[PDB]
Amino acid sequence: GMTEYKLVVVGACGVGKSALTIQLIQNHFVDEYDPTIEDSYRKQVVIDGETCLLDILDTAGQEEYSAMRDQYMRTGEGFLCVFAINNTKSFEDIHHYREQIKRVKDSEDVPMVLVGNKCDLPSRTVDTKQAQDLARSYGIPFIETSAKTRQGVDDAFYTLVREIRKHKEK
């Protein structure tokens, strides 16, 4: 089978986790996606000449059982840590997702990319420099995206795969 990358999109409710994923897979922007739905999507793509499969979990926070959260974190190879540039709280929540994933996987080296979504909106509470400082402290890539205009969407997901590849080669 071709190589599969198991990706997990995390972040506060409403940041655009679903919108980003759907834009990547289905190439359209969704105005309204039920905030309570958590499904996974698969798509064959070509990244740097490699034909591969992206298996993407679009999370929705709480689970029936917390064991289910622990399961997807352990199974996940890479994580998109998404906040919205007009939601300071979502940016502050990133600390908690970072910590929780490393905790579950019991690892200090977990492939992650920081994603500042909704960058199409003029309304902004989180400056690019603030997110850059955070990503610097984590030693991960930071990318601003818009699920609406598709700006940066492929870059976020593909960078995360490249991060996973760097991790694996060790």
Ligand X SMILES: CC(=O)NCCOP(=O)(O)OP(=O)(O)OC[C@H]1O[C@@H](n2cnc3c(=O)[nH]c(N)nc32)[C@H](O)[C@@H]1O
Q: Which two tokens stand for residue 32?
A: 């309204």
Instruction: Tell me how many residues contact Mg ion (CB under 5 A).
Output: 1
Can residue 68 be called a binding residue for ligand X (CB under 6 A)? no
d(CA 32, CA 11): 17
Q: Which residues contact 120 (CB under 8 A, 6 or more apart)?
A: 146, 148, 149, 151
Q: Which of the ranges 12-20, 21-29, 90-98, 106-114 carries the binding residues for Mg ion, by CB under 5 A?
A: 12-20
Can residue 147 be called a binding residue for ligand X (CB under 6 A)? yes
Instruction: Between 146 and 159, name the residue whose CB sits nearer to ligand X.
Output: 146
Can residue 87 be called a binding residue for Mg ion (CB under 5 A)? no
Can residue 18 be called a binding residue for Mg ion (CB under 5 A)? yes
Amino acid in position 165 = R
Helix (H, G, I), strand (E, B) or coil at 168: helix
d(CA 4, CA 2): 6
Backbone φ and ψ of 153, nearest 5°: -65, -55
Q: CB of residue 161 vs ligand X: minimum separation in angstroms?
A: 21
Instruction: Between 115 and 165, name the residue whose CB sits nearer to ligand X.
Output: 115
Question: Is the CB of residue 72 less than 8 Å from the CB of residue 53?
Answer: no
**Helix 17-26 crosses helix 153-168 at what angle (to 10 degrees)?**
90
Q: After which residues is the chain broken (C to N over 2.5 A)?
A: none
Q: Which of the ranges 6-14, 73-81, 105-113, 156-164 carries the binding residues for ligand X, by CB under 6 A?
A: 6-14
Instruction: Between 18 and 145, name the residue whose CB sits nearer to Mg ion.
Output: 18
Letters for 13-42 (x = contact with ligand X by CB under 6 A, - = none) are: xxxxxxx----------xxxx-x-------
Decide which of Mg ion, ligand X, none touches 166; Cβ closer than 5 to 8 Å per partner kind. Answer: none
Query: Residue numbers of the site for ligand X (CB under 6 A)?
Result: 11, 13-19, 30-33, 35, 60-61, 117-118, 120-121, 146-148
